[PDB]
Structures are given as structure tokens and as C-alpha cells.
Ligand binder design. Structure first.
Ligand code: ADP
Ligand code: SMI
Ligand code: MG
Ligand code: NI
Length: 329
């Protein structure tokens, strides 16, 4: 909600030379730095992002590399009048894209054919060669204990309190009920991290967060991998962990996993790194949701979501049960 309709309209007119007659702010949003609007002209619809991050230029750098590489399953930004993929403004950055109406994977299942196409495209991304100038700017997999420590710092905080409101209490209670599994996730991630032999030579370009929510499933063959904010250099397992990973209660049907590899190309998958990620990723979520639900912070309009998502992870056939089900790797 930084600017208003008629304010974005002028900014798009001045910097993009586009004549928009209607623009609406969109809900959801990543949070903090991340606003999204739908702006329409007489003939087209645009999806506008007003970012406030730092890596936006290096990430645009990655889709620029992917577009050069011939990957069509990505939404290429719209050029500013200065031939740039983004317009640097006073306090924020503008990034326009054409508007894609397809629903994400949490709502639309992929057909066997689309599953093959996703495997084919992920392989393409992984096989993509990255210029050393970009590799030096991309974060690398260093198996940081950062999130495991934060979750542990929670261990000794889940105790009855009078200052906590209903939400905080319900969270501590839920935490206590699943304390065993929570420690197991942290311990298994820590354990597996030491069992892994870091071989920088086997690191490929990874999306790092390619679950169903980051896939727009259009008609057919018109699917799109979005959310290119965390690309990194790491083992391919960083991304393969999602196939059959169960994020969002989908992508948890074993028979689709084969459809996927049909296009990715059945190859050797390190079952240990693949298991590490499935555990570590949940540890990260526990840590992020945990901090939000404990800080108490009033401006936390997110606590509601954080709690819902937190518990969502422990549901039947969701990410926790799938990570624990080693026989699925
Ligand atoms: N080009 C686009 N056109 C239409 N909707 C889009 C477009 N890009 C993203 N979206 C919508 O926004 C949602 C979140 O996008 P994403 O890039 O993952 O942002 P965030 O990192 O905040 O989750 C997607 O589920 C989709 O509904
Ligand atoms: C910054 N990336 C996002 C964060 O990691 C976020 N957790 C703080 C993730 O939450 C999720 O893992 C998944 O993907 C979300 C990620 O895309 O998004 C779902 C809506 C909720 C989830 O629990 O299923
Ligand atoms: Mg997303
Ligand atoms: Ni193109």
C-alpha cells in the first residue's frame, strides 16, 4: 500500500510509457518489503511488484540468464523506456511483468504431461552454466546452523505465562505437544549435515524454493516457475527435495514423482542430502514462525498465518511425516 492507484499509473506512464486506466493493490504479499498490483491498459494486464530488497538485481540476473538459455517457463519482466528490467525509484524499485491468470500448484494439479515438463525444465535450470561473475554474487550452500540454533533457543521458552495472549498460549501448547518431533527435526538436520561431504564441484543453479505455490499451472505446457528471489548454488537435491516433498499438502503422491523424473532424466540422487533439506527446510519454517509467534510484537498481523502454517506442517502426509518417512527418499 505504498502508493495509490493514480500514483502507480503515473509511475508506469513516466517510466514504462504504458497507459493504464485501472490498478488495484493485491493482498497476500510476502511481507515487509513486497507490494503487488494488477495494472490494466486498454489491451493488456500487468503484474506490478514494488520491491525493497537488495538481491533483486542479482536475481533478475538469474532469469536473464535463464531467458538467454531458452527456458520459456519463466515470466520475463517488462522493459522500462530505458531498456531496463526494473525502474529504480526514490525509495523503492518497480518490476512489471505481464499478468498470468493461471492458479498456483496449491490449487491446480499438474497433469502427467505437465509433470514431465517440470522435470525437463528443472533439469534445464540445473544444467545451466553460470558466469563466474554471477557465481560470486550468488549465495552458496554452507549448511549453516543458523536456523537449528534459533529453534533450540525456543526449547526453553515454551512455559506457561500470564502475559501471553490466547494465540501465544495456543502456540506454546501446540509446540509442547509436538516437542518430540520438533527436536527430532532439529537433531536429524544437524546429524545429517555432518554426515554430508560438501563437494562444491557438484553444486548447480538452484531455485531453492520450488514447491507447488511457486508454480503457476496454466492450460497445458503453459506452466511457470515464479518466485526467483532465493536462487543459489547448491546440490541439485536442494530442489529435488520438493518432488514428493509434500509442501502445501500436494506433491505428495508417489506416482507423480516418476512422471517428473521422466522429464528430468532418471539420475543419481543423493538420498542423504535430499533428506537433510526436507528436515532443514522445516526447521527454518519452525524458526521463522516461532520467532513471529513469540516476539509478541503488536504489529504482527502475521502471527495468525504463522501459527496456521506452523501447525499445517504436522498434518497427515504433510512435510513433517514425509521427512520422517525415510523410506520415501
Ligand atoms: N506475473 C504474474 N501474474 C499474475 N500473478 C502473479 C505473477 N507473479 C506472481 N503472481 C502471483 O503472486 C503469488 C506469489 O508470487 P511469488 O513470486 O511467490 O511472491 P512471494 O515471494 O511474495 O510469495 C503467486 O501465487 C501468484 O498468485
Ligand atoms: C521465503 N519463502 C517462503 C518462506 O520460507 C515461508 N515460510 C516462512 C514458506 O512457507 C511455506 O513453507 C511455503 O513456502 C514458503 C516460502 O516460499 O509456503 C506456504 C504458503 C507455507 C509453507 O509453510 O507451506
Ligand atoms: Mg511464492
Ligand atoms: Ni522471451
Amino acid at each position: 500500500q505504498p502508493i495509490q492507484a493514480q500514483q502507480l499509473i503515473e509511475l508506469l506512464k513516466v517510466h514504462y510509457g504504458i497507459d493504464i486506466h485501472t490498478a488495484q493493490f493485491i493482498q497476500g504479499g510476502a511481507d515487509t518489503n513486497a507490494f503487488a498490483y494488477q495494472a490494466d491498459s486498454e489491451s493488456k494486464s500487468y503484474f506490478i511488484k514494488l520491491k525493497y530488497g537488495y538481491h533483486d538485481e542479482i536475481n533478475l540476473s538469474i532469469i536473464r540468464l535463464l531467458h538467454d538459455s531458452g527456458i520459456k517457463e519463466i515470466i520475463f519482466p517488462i522493459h522500462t523506456l530505458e531498456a531496463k528490467l526494473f525502474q529504480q525509484l526514490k525509495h523503492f524499485k518497480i518490476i512489471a511483468y505481464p499478468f498470468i491468470h493461471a492458479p498456483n500448484g496449491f490449487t491446480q494439479n499438474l497433469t502427467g504431461k505437465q509433470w514431465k515438463q517440470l522435470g525437463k525444465v528443472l533439469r534445464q535450470i540445473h544444467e545451466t552454466s553460470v558466469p563466474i561473475s554471477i557465481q560470486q554474487q550468488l549465495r552458496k550452500e554452507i549448511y549453516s546452523p543458523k536456523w537449528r540454533e534459533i529453534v533450540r533457543s525456543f526449547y526453553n521458552q515454551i512455559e506457561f505465562d500470564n502475559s501471553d495472549d490466547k494465540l501465544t498460549a495456543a502456540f506454546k501448547s501446540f509446540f509442547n505437544q509436538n516437542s518430540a518431533a520438533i527436536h527430532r527435526l532439529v537433531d536429524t538436520s544437524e546429524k545429517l549435515s555432518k554426515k554430508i561431504q560438501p563437494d562444491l564441484d557438484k553444486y548447480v543453479l538452484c531455485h531453492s524454493d520450488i514447491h507447488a505455490g511457486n508454480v503457476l499451472v496454466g492450460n497445458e505446457e503453459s506452466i511457470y516457475i515464479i518466485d526467483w528471489d532465493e536462487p543459489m548454488l547448491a546440490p541439485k537435491e536442494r530442489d529435488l527435495m520438493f518432488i514428493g516433498g509434500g509442501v502445501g499438502n500436494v506433491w505428495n503422491k508417489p506416482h507423480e514423482i516418476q512422471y517428473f523424473y521422466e522429464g528430468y532424466g532418471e539420475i543419481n540422487v543423493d538420498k542423504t542430502i535430499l533428506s537433510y533439506y526436507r528436515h532443514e527446510r522445516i526447521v527454518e519454517d519452525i524458526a521463522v514462525y516461532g520467532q513471529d509467534l513469540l516476539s509478541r510484537n503488536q504489529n504482527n498481523q502475521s502471527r495468525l498465518e504463522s501459527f496456521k502454517y506452523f501447525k499445517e506442517m504436522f498434518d497427515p502426509n504433510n512435510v513433517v511425516e514425509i521427512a520422517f518417512a525415510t523410506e520415501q527418499l
